[PDB]
Amino acid sequence: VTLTLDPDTANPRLILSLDLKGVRLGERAQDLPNHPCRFDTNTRVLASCGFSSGRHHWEVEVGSKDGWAFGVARESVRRKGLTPFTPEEGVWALQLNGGQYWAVTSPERSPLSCGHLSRVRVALDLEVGAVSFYAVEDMRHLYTFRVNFQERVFPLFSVCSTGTYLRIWPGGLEALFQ
Amino acid sequence: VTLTLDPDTANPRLILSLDLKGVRLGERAQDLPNHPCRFDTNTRVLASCGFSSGRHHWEVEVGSKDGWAFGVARESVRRKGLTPFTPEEGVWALQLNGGQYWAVTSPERSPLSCGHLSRVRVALDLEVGAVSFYAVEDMRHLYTFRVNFQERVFPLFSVCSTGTYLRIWPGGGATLEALFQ
Prior knowledge:
The structure is a homodimer. Chain A is mainly beta. The first copy, chain A, is 0% helix and 40% strand. Chain A is globular and about 50 Å long. The N and C termini of chain A lie far apart (45 Å). The interface between A and B is medium-sized, with 22 and 15 residues. Chain A: This is E3 ubiquitin-protein ligase TRIM7.
């Protein structure tokens, strides 16, 4: 079965698509049951399935404008209260913010060298300890985080502004410097 | 046919552009004639054209810094003395203040997680009773006030600090944006 988004993790301001494969930010909080896995402040949602071993691919269709971040998270990522969006919190992600694409390193983010992004392939390797991101149009390498994950790892999605979105699929300006 | 700011309504601290499309806050009050229509304390200005029926669109280019608010006002909005900037006083507006975008509801404003704004389309519908705001780059919906307007309604603009501006176009902070990521 393909990955879907887990409604029990979803921040109540998010709207998950009917097919549970897309996420955007709504204008009001839904009245959802309190759940210990639910992100109650940060605008995050996990996939239905997490991985403790092996190699795993999925793809992410990304909105053209600011507000999204996605990647993977350790299962122990904190759900309760306002939390930082940083590798220290067990989140390893790409982000579109300020009109720029970033790998969310810390304390400073790392700007990506890439064209406009539309579809990104995520390659999670729990045997080696890495998560890698590729732009599908030309298979350009965007970023690799090397991490000894040491627990179960979940696909992670976040949308903190309206006017953008993320959608999950099965696997399969640099010109300023001219 | 296209909207222009009305200098006789403008608070004397405001500076209007020559083409009457833009407004910012000056550093001194101009010596302008008293008129019952002039906002003498709040930093407001209306367009010269108001609407008692029909549907009407215009667009507003907005500065990136705090200090502006814009939308529509009922004609009877109070002009004299310090007045509240609230729907009860007949103003229905978006605002950039404290690094956040707001729909100016009352008693508490409504924070908008809309991302950065550059230009906003205002859709005034006096036939159904609504005023709606959209970000022009994708027309994402920002806010709608549903109001049984009972009088003539005017485009409204306010700028209460220097370093920002509003500008009318024809109908056709930064790192707090991702705080909740």
